[PDB]
Amino acid sequence: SSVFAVCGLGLLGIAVSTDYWLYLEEGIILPQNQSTEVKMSLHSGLWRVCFLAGEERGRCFTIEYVMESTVNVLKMIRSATPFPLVSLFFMFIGFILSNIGHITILAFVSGIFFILSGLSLVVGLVLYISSINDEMLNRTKDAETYFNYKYGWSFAFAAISFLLTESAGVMSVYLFMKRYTAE
Amino acid sequence: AFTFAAFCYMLTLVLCASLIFFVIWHIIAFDELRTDNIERICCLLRKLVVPEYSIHGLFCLMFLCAAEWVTLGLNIPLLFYHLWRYFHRPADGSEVMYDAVSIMNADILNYCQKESWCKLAFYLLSFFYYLYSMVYTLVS
Amino acid sequence: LESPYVMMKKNHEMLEGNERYEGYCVDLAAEIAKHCGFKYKLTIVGDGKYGARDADTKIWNGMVGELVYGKADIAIAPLTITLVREEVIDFSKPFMSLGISIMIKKPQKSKPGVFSFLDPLAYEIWMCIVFAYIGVSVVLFLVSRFSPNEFGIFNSLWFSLGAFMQQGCDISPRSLSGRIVGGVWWFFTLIIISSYTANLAAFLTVERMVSPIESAEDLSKQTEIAYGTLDSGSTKEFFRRSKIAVFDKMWTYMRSAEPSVFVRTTAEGVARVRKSKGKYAYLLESTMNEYIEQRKPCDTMKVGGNLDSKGYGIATPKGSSLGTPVNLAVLKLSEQGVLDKLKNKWWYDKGECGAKDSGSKEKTSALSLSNVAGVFYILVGGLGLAMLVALIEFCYKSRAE
Amino acid sequence: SGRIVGGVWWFFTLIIISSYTANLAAFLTVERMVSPIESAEDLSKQTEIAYGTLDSGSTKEFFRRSKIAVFDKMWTYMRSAEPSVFVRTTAEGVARVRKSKGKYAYLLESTMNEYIEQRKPCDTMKVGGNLDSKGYGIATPKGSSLGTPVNLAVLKLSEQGVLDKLKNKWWYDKGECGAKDSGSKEKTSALSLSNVAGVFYILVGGLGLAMLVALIEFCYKSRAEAACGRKALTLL
Amino acid sequence: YGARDADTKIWNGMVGELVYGKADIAIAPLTITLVREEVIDFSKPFMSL
Amino acid sequence: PNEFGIFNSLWFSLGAFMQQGCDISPRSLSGRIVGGVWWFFTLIIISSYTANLAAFLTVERMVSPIESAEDLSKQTEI
Ligand SMILES: N[C@@H](CCC(=O)O)C(=O)O
Ligand SMILES: N[C@@H](CCC(=O)O)C(=O)O
């Protein structure tokens, strides 16, 4: 129950820091199917969003301005930003109170904070993904252009940490179910 | 033309015809109290108290959602009455109220006998009032 | 140079002559030369900013900057017959007549809301169910209590909800009259779920769409969008002299518009619809709009129709002796249908579109998460209610001690 | 012996319900395909609806003469009338729409068509855009002395703002039918109560039966307090 | 309102009360068309159709 | 205020999402609401699923192959 808590903090911490949430492969088409080369292709993150093909320069920008569709997504990710932060808040609170219980309700209430982090992270993934399909649908249907959003490495850092928290969510209560019955 | 508020008048005729049946045991059990056993009628009539009151609390929530501001007014003093008749009384605290097994104290048999022909008065003409606004909306 | 009346085709980088500047009216120069006899000289106005004699300067602008001053005498081109232009110009009879038109962007699919899951059953039935939930949940309670009991209220808000999501029951009412309610409550759930599923199979198959800024009287009235339009020329000037009150409040909202009261360039006013797409509603003349809507991006659409009747007549600078060979020729091109034959030609040249492209071309997508996105908010938000009651249930047992 | 009756009745309730959710998703995706007529070239295909205009007016001349070739096909079926699709006059032309019950269309001028749909039996609507554009004119005989005074009048009466006040004057107040088109631009698509109504009547009528059965067993409970069944069964 | 027929039977309608000489000025819903243009005269268009 | 483990709560949860029954049947107002809205969540996802699978199959059945030249006269795609 300590190990799932220990592994839970780092995986989302990598995810909330890294710049590989979302891909993009905005290109074109030609007859004889002759598609494209790269035309506009960015990977993206949560705080630092780094272009890769449209200008090759990684303008990993503290998001307030430019450096057309991309920042429009980043205004919607801004609405979806706090829930991985809220999940990181209740994860660390659940981590500290778990070791204090190692040194009663002190360990049991930590398992409350694993779930309240995880339920923050489910809505965090939902509002993030529903933000993309908002901006997917605002992209005008066009035979030339195309759009290839792709969920990058950070979700396996993030959503697997949701499994880690809920594993640590249920370990803490059986920890409370083995310790209270000894009392 | 069936509407939502028209369904709220069909539903109360199903419910208030049982609410007039809640208060047919208000007056026949007092008929058994005036002819006479007390703790039997105490144990019986303490039960059907929150049923006959919270069904009335349902409709004030209902016609708010039905947005009928007329009939919301035409029962809100009884909800004010059902609240006020409630809250002073459960100081005995057995299950709810309305008997307090020494019910045979004076002046409370007749004050509830005022209520015996007050509920059977108000529910009966409202029963034909909900049937009035049922047909007023159903074929409009 | 404009849309299909006159433009420079790129073959003049090879070709010369009449083939420098081509289009509809360039063919019309041929069949008017069958009666007037006079040849062409395709001179695009470099100053072309259609205009009139300008405000407080009285200088004729652009095309009337070439036509009025004796620099030109025939004006076979798109030019609107204005009454203040009639003050300046002896015209001919109009080719065709246009109206003030609305170029709205082609309605792309709306973003479904967070609560778009309960679209296929209206906001009355989802209200009737909840009151017919309670109104049936209570009647099991009232039946099995005044009859010989595990049916509490809290067990009868569970049987009824246990049947509406079709999940069944282990309670299973045991009277005759407690089974009649639970009998025909089941048959209510067989029809509403099979009308929810049935209707949601009809949104996802035949998706008729809404063009919400149609029927231009409430384009002005229901003020929601950018009242974009062209610059100096005929369109603003008819609204400058607004005396029908429905157009005047439309004009004051263009008079109180910002920053794009006008912009410029019929080509650009297409593009400003094409890229803004949220509110820009480029308010141009009629027959240019059906060119853009037809051509092949198929991304604009004409809502409403023909707010005026304004004509395309050949402008002759006030007396201008060629006008009588001009207007008699046009009559022999109109009654013979030669101009109508030219209308039949030049508006069926390009790749045809409209509902013509909307033939047997559907591919329908899978549901995104944004279609059912609110159910997870109800699901997760349903959990934070039940864990809240857990602490309140645990509080009223510990403080019962 | 007793699970097979419950076996195939479980199969019978899978095919009837799954047939029922099939066709109820086949009314609703068929009567959603039905596009109303919205343009003349759409009406050019739709031979189901009868489209006749006014006889001996300018409109009958318009379909005969021009060659936009949607109209040539429109004139062609209009010339192949069965029976006579021209009516003779507009007031008789409204009634032929009124009495065909969504089967006779009637081509007429815009300024008249807007007034007809603003009349108390509101069951008409202006379908598409204008097929063309013309103008109303005040007529003088060919080269008479009355020509230019009236011609100077309408020029003067324009910028005085009177003739477009008259445009309002006999039309602006004429929404006396009520203008019910104003509250119907949603064209909503969910089921209403009108679709699923008989279920609630079965729902309420089930409750009204079940309370009376709850009464009829309580009285049978109390009257029971104050070979008999076999001979009663043997008779029945 | 006004039209033209087989020989001419002149201009059957309200223009038959106006080109025949039954009456002068013809304030009406009469619509300007080019067959009417050549046979009688008109004002400026005062409404749009 | 036992019969719910963590594995006996998986088996209720999977039981409700494929809409089959469950003998388990929770008992508390804290504990019936989780089973309440998960019962609502499994009504919208399945009824969305039988919607669109009856919308691929009634869309790709509408697709008429080209069979005549006047049909091909409209079909500018090919
Ligand atoms: N034909 C118009 C073009 C400009 C406009 O549409 O406003 C004119 O010459 O004024
Ligand atoms: N006012 C019209 C009526 C006939 C028509 O609508 O074509 C006319 O004089 O020609």
Distance, CA of C5 to chain centre: 26
CB C177 within 8 A of CB D214: yes
CB atoms within 10 A of CB A144: 9
Long-range contact list for E11-20, CB < 8 A, 24+ apart? E11/E39, E12/D56, E13/D56, E15/D139, E15/E39, E15/E40, E18/D139, E18/D141, E19/D141, E19/D142
Half-sphere exposure of D77 (CA within 13 A, CB side): 16
Vertex C95 angle, CA C93 and C99, to 5°: 105
As a 3-state breakdown, chain C gives helix, strand, coil percent values, each rounded to 5, of 45, 5, 50
Query: Residue C397: which H helix or E strand, with range?
Result: helix C373-398
Rounded to the nearest 10°, the torsion over CA B24, B28, B33, B36 is: -170
CB atoms within 10 A of CB D68: 18
Q: Closest by alpha carbon to D116, among D90, D89, D85?
A: D90
CA end-to-end span of chain B = 6
Give me ligand 2 centre to Cα D61, in Å. Answer: 10
d(CA A116, CA A113) in angstroms, rounded, equals 5
CA end-to-end span of chain D = 29
Rounded to the nearest 10°, the torsion over CA D50, D51, D56, D58 is: 180
Question: Is the CB–ligand 2 distance for residue D59 below 6 Å?
Answer: yes
CB A113 within 8 A of CB A98: no
Q: Closest by alpha carbon to A46, among A79, A24, A69?
A: A79
Q: Closest by alpha carbon to B112, among B40, B56, B42?
A: B42
Rounded to the nearest 10°, the torsion over CA A30, A33, A38, A44 is: 110
Question: Is the CB–ligand 2 distance for residue D109 below 6 Å?
Answer: yes
Strands D50-53, C97-98: pairing is: unpaired
Quick one: tokens of C126? Answer: 């989802």
Q: C353-388 burial by CB neighbour count: b if 16+ within 10 A, else e?
A: beeeeeeeeeeeeebbbbbbbbbbbbbbebbeebbe
Does the beta-carbon distance from E46 to D137 stay under 8 Å?
A: yes
Sign of CA dihedral B126, B129, B135, B138: negative
For residue D52, the SS3 value is strand
Tell me if chain F has a CB within 8 Å of the CB of C386: yes
Q: Closest by alpha carbon to A146, among A47, A10, A24, A27?
A: A27
Length of chain C: 401
- Whose Cα sits closest to atom 3 in ligand 2? D57
d(CA C164, CA D199) in angstroms, rounded, equals 14
CB A16 within 8 A of CB A84: yes
Vertex A19 angle, CA A92 and A88, to 5°: 10
For residue C228, the SS3 value is coil
d(CA C83, CA D6) in angstroms, rounded, equals 87
DSSP category for residue C182? H
State the amino acid at position D212 in one-letter form: L
Among candidates C306, C308, C335 on the partner chain, residue whose Cβ is nearest the Cβ of E34 = C335
In angstroms, the Cα distances linking D125 to D34, D90, D113 are 18, 15, 8
Phi and psi torsions of A85, nearest 5°: -75, -40
d(CA B51, CA E22) in angstroms, rounded, equals 90
Quick one: tokens of D151? Answer: 């011609």
Distance, CA of E21 to chain centre: 12
Give me ligand 1 centre to Cα C234, in Å. Answer: 4
Q: Closest by alpha carbon to A160, among A23, A13, A1, A2?
A: A13
d(CA B27, CA B41) in angstroms, rounded, equals 12
d(CA D8, CA D10) in angstroms, rounded, equals 5
Does the beta-carbon distance from B18 to D211 stay under 8 Å?
A: yes
Continuous H helices in C244-337: 245-255, 266-276, 286-292, 323-334
DSSP category for residue F18? T
Half-sphere exposure of C130 (CA within 13 A, CB side): 10
CB atoms within 10 A of CB D121: 10
Give me ligand 1 centre to Cα A36, in Å. Answer: 42
As a 3-state breakdown, chain E gives helix, strand, coil percent values, each rounded to 5, of 20, 15, 65
Quick one: tokens of D13? Answer: 């309730």
Please name every residue paired with A44 in a beta bridge, in sequence order, or none if there are none. Answer: A22
Give me ligand 1 centre to Cα C310, in Å. Answer: 10
d(CA D110, CA B101) in angstroms, rounded, equals 84
d(CA C265, CA C261) in angstroms, rounded, equals 14
Residue D2 gets the label, from left (phi > 0), alpha (psi -120 to 50) or beta, of: alpha
Assigned CATH class of C1-105: alpha beta
For C310, name the nearest residue in chain E, comparing CA atoms only.
Answer: E48
**Cα Rg of chain F (Å, integer):** 23
In angstroms, the Cα distances linking B120 to B8, B9, B114 are 22, 19, 10
Quick one: tokens of C194? Answer: 């099979």
Tell me if chain B has a CB within 8 Å of the CB of C145: yes
E4 is in an annotated binding site: no
Burial class (CB in 10 A: 0-12, 13-18, 19+), D21: buried
Does the beta-carbon distance from E42 to D144 stay under 8 Å?
A: no
Among candidates F22, F34, F48 on the partner chain, residue whose Cβ is nearest the Cβ of C372 = F48
Quick one: tokens of A134? Answer: 């908002």
Vertex D211 angle, CA D205 and D217, to 5°: 135
Task: Return all residues near E19 (Cβ < 8 A) that are at least 6 apart.
Answer: D141, D142, E10, E11, E39, E40
Does the beta-carbon distance from D193 to B2 stay under 8 Å?
A: yes
For residue C168, the SS3 value is coil
Phi and psi torsions of C26, nearest 5°: -70, -35
CB atoms within 10 A of CB C106: 17
Q: Closest by alpha carbon to F34, among F23, F25, F47, F44?
A: F25
CB atoms within 10 A of CB C237: 16
d(CA C202, CA C199) in angstroms, rounded, equals 5
d(CA C211, CA C327) in angstroms, rounded, equals 41
Binding residues of C for L-glutamate: 78, 80, 85, 234-235, 285
For residue C100, the SS3 value is strand
Residue with tokens 């318009």: D62
Phi and psi torsions of C21, nearest 5°: -130, 115
Sign of CA dihedral C95, C101, C105, C111: negative
For D22, name the nearest residue in chain F, comparing CA atoms only.
Answer: F54
D109 is in an annotated binding site: yes
Give me ligand 2 centre to Cα D108, in Å. Answer: 8
Q: Closest by alpha carbon to D210, among B131, C147, C188, C143?
A: C143
Residue C71 gets the label, from left (phi > 0), alpha (psi -120 to 50) or beta, of: alpha
d(CA C297, CA C279) in angstroms, rounded, equals 19
Resolution to 1 decimal, in Å? 3.9
CB B58 within 8 A of CB B16: no
For C133, name the nearest residue in chain D, comparing CA atoms only.
Answer: D203
d(CA C27, CA C30) in angstroms, rounded, equals 5
In angstroms, the Cα distances linking F45 to A159, C206, C374, F38 are 21, 20, 11, 11
Residue A42 gets the label, from left (phi > 0), alpha (psi -120 to 50) or beta, of: beta
Q: E14-29 burial by CB neighbour count: b if 16+ within 10 A, else e?
A: bbeebbeeeeebbeee
Does the beta-carbon distance from D193 to C128 stay under 8 Å?
A: yes
Strands D139-140, E41-42: pairing is: antiparallel
Phi and psi torsions of C106, nearest 5°: -60, 130
In angstroms, the Cα distances linking E17 to C211, D139, E22, E26, E31 are 47, 11, 5, 9, 15
For residue C141, the SS3 value is helix
Residue with tokens 């965090």: A124
CB D90 within 8 A of CB D54: yes
d(CA C284, CA C148) in angstroms, rounded, equals 78
d(CA A85, CA A65) in angstroms, rounded, equals 22
CB C40 within 8 A of CB C25: no
Does the beta-carbon distance from A141 to C108 stay under 8 Å?
A: yes
Sign of CA dihedral E11, E14, E16, E21: negative
Q: Closest by alpha carbon to A72, among A150, A27, A131, A147?
A: A131
Residue with tokens 């002299």: C241
In angstroms, the Cα distances linking C171 to C154, C163, C257, F33, F35 are 12, 11, 66, 17, 16
CB C222 within 8 A of CB C210: no
Give helix C125-145 / helix D198-223 axis angle, nearest 10°: 10
d(CA C164, CA F40) in angstroms, rounded, equals 9
Task: Return all residues near D179 (Cβ < 8 A) that are at least 6 apart.
Answer: D118
Continuous H helices in A103-152: 105-138
Vertex C190 angle, CA C187 and C194, to 5°: 150
Residue with tokens 């409630």: B86
Strands D50-53, D104-107: pairing is: parallel
Task: Return all residues near B70 (Cβ < 8 A) that are at least 6 apart.
Answer: none
Looking at all shown ligands, the one closest to residue D60's CA atom is: 2
**Cα Rg of chain D (Å, integer):** 33
Query: Residue D136: which H helix or E strand, with range?
Result: strand D135-136
D80 is in an annotated binding site: no
d(CA C86, CA C52) in angstroms, rounded, equals 11
d(CA A81, CA B103) in angstroms, rounded, equals 64
CB A26 within 8 A of CB A147: yes
The DSSP code sequence of D170-186 is TTTT--TT--GGGG-TT
State the amino acid at position A135 in one-letter form: E
Vertex D90 angle, CA D84 and D96, to 5°: 50
Strands C310-311, D135-136: pairing is: unpaired
d(CA C295, CA C350) in angstroms, rounded, equals 6
Chain breaks in chain C (C to N over 2.5 A) after: 148
DSSP category for residue D82? S
d(CA A83, CA A122) in angstroms, rounded, equals 9
The DSSP code sequence of A50-109 is -B-SSSS------SSS---HHHHHHHHHHHHTHHHHHHHHHHHHHHHHHHHHH--HHHHH
d(CA D211, CA C290) in angstroms, rounded, equals 67
Q: Closest by alpha carbon to E45, among D128, D157, C239, C238?
A: D157
DSSP category for residue C18? G
Rounded to the nearest 10°, the torsion over CA A161, A162, A164, A166 is: 170
